Amino acid sequence: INPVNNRIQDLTERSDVLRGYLDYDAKKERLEEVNAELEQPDVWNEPERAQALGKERSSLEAVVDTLDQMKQGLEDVSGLLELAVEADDEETFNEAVAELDALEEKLAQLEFRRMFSGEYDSADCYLDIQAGSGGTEAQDWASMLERMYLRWAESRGFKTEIIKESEGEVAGIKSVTIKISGDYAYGWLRTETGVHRLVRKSPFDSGGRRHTSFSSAFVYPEVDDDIDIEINPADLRIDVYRTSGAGGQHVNRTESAVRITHIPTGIVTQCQNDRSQHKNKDQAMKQMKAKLYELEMQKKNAEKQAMEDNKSDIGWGSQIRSYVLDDSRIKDLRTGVETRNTQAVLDGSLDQFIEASLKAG
């Protein structure tokens, strides 16, 4: 009974949090404005505008109608629970429990969508941990972070494997790459990207001074393998001509050199090494395929390099989560969530921080 009331209060707070995160007043006003515009005849004068307003109305209607139905269901379940407890009706109590479970699953589906609105949130992920400013202390801290994330993955039921690892010579690990597989693994882990600051009496200092070490965790989704696309022959222009420095009547006369131009790109390859035009054309086609693939590879490398330049350095001022063990306090800089059970957090109780980050969005 009291746990059911606590569940109802939690659902009420979750519904209010959803309404306020979504600014239910703002969304309802926007929906009303869209309704007025759509009642106006001039709205369909621009078909793209009318379709956009229709899709916007459908989404706003989904949200608004879902919330309007949800609130009423919660009030009804509260009333039926009061009646069932008063009348000591076990069947009605069980029916109300089933209704509350169904409504909780519904609100949970909404919460899940809001938690993972990102495109690749469903995919598996890769986690890279790199030591930073602390040196040997940083490498030990990196090993601690690796253990923490592995424990958290075990708790969530995801499957982990170690693709690559580089261990520090004195202690810890310099870097590690781990593959995480599971449902919405990237969605659950993507908020842990950043630099983690650690403050503890360094075990690698003879004086036992209080040093600060930094380690970086970077989470990226598992990209799907690209489908190979054969070159559409209508995209190529092939020119056959005499090769340079042609020696002899035959070579002077024959059109052996081949040049292939890719119309969409403008990239050109050319081969004239062989006597045979067919062999030259095959080699030029291979070079054209290689050049198109290299162009795509250069695009991919540019994206990766932009990400590397975007990655903040593993050092002072780049912390997003501070683990101070002397003060026995862990604080997330982004969300403000603070805990004192450093041992539990190091053992894998990351759900508080991760859920806070996802709710903040």
* Minimum separation from the CB atom of position 247 to RNA (A): 5
Tokens of 266: 């403008």
* Minimum separation from the CB atom of position 53 to RNA (A): 9
Spatial neighbors of 330 by CB under 8 A, at least 6 apart, are 321, 322, 323, 324, 338, 339, 340, 342, 345
DSSP E strands: which ranges in 204-350?
Answer: 210-221, 236-241, 257-262, 268-271, 319-324, 329-332, 338-339
Strand partners, 197: 214, 322
Q: Which is nearer to RNA, 169 or 226 (CB)?
A: 169
Q: How far apart are CA 135 and CA 137, in angstroms?
A: 5
Q: Which amino acid is residue 265, in one-letter code?
A: T
* Minimum separation from the CB atom of position 143 to RNA (A): 13
* Minimum separation from the CB atom of position 208 to RNA (A): 13
Q: Which is nearer to RNA, 89 or 274 (CB)?
A: 274
Query: What 3-state DSSP class applies to 212?
Result: strand
Spatial neighbors of 236 by CB under 8 A, at least 6 apart, are 260, 261, 262, 263, 288
Q: Which is nearer to RNA, 191 or 280 (CB)?
A: 280
Percent helix / strand / coil, the chain, rounded to 5: 55, 20, 25
Q: Which is nearer to RNA, 54 or 118 (CB)?
A: 54
Tokens of 306: 């932009």
* Minimum separation from the CB atom of position 24 to RNA (A): 20
Q: Which is nearer to RNA, 58 or 109 (CB)?
A: 58
* Minimum separation from the CB atom of position 170 to RNA (A): 5
Q: Tokens 């340079």 map to which residue? A: 244
Torsion sign over Cα 263, 269, 274, 280: negative
* Terminal-residue alpha carbon distance, the chain: 34
Q: Which is nearer to RNA, 275 or 278 (CB)?
A: 275
Q: How far apart are CA 170 and CA 192, in angstroms?
A: 27
* Minimum separation from the CB atom of position 251 to RNA (A): 5
Q: Which is nearer to RNA, 261 or 287 (CB)?
A: 287
* Minimum separation from the CB atom of position 311 to RNA (A): 28
* Minimum separation from the CB atom of position 109 to RNA (A): 14
Query: What 3-state DSSP class applies to 173?
Result: strand
DSSP secondary structure letter of residue 182: S
Pair type for strands 319-324 and 194-201:
parallel
Q: Which is nearer to RNA, 273 or 328 (CB)?
A: 273
Tokens of 356: 């806070």
Q: Which residues bind RNA (CB under 7 A)?
A: 44, 47, 50-51, 54-55, 57-58, 61, 169-170, 247-248, 250-251, 274-275
Q: Which is nearer to RNA, 17 or 251 (CB)?
A: 251
